[PDB]
Amino acid sequence: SNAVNEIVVNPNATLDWQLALRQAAGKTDLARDMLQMLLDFLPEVRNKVEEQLVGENPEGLVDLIHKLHGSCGYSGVPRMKNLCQLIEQQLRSGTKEEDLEPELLELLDEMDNVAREASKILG
Ligand SMILES: [Ca+2]
């Protein structure tokens, strides 16, 4: 099927600011900076994921997804973090990379969703 999942069950599945604060010593400034740094990293990941999706077989995909997974842990982006877990764990279990295209497309979508939520959160 061409379809991927576009249902986000609740906007806190995209950005959970109370989770973000809980991971940043309860500090607004640190949670701010960590979210900013995540947003500034996403385009590098987007570009690699797009290359993968069009058959360029880029080097370093799983290691970059792993890095994004870790980065998510410093903030509060549950859907994104879990997408990274799905992608990496499937890749580690030997799944052909082409089979994971739906999750890669969902990750691209979630990058946009996170940016939208991030642009509002501190007002
Ligand atoms: Ca922590």
How far, CA to CA in Å, does 30 sit from each of 21, 27, 72, 77, 89?
A: 8, 5, 14, 15, 30
Distance from residue 2's CA to the centre of ligand 1 (Å): 37
Q: By what method was this entry solved?
A: X-ray
Distance from residue 73's CA to the centre of ligand 1 (Å): 7
Name the CATH superfamily for 10-123.
HPT domain (1.20.120.160)
Please give the biggest Cα pair distance in the chain: 44
Distance from residue 34's CA to the centre of ligand 1 (Å): 12
What is the domain partition of the chain in residue ranges? Answer: 10-123
DSSP string, 87-122: HHHHHHTT--GGGGHHHHHHHHHHHHHHHHHHHHTT
DSSP string, 39-58: HHHHHHHHHHHHHHHTT---
Do 62 and 52 meet the contact criterion of CB atoms below 8 Å apart? no
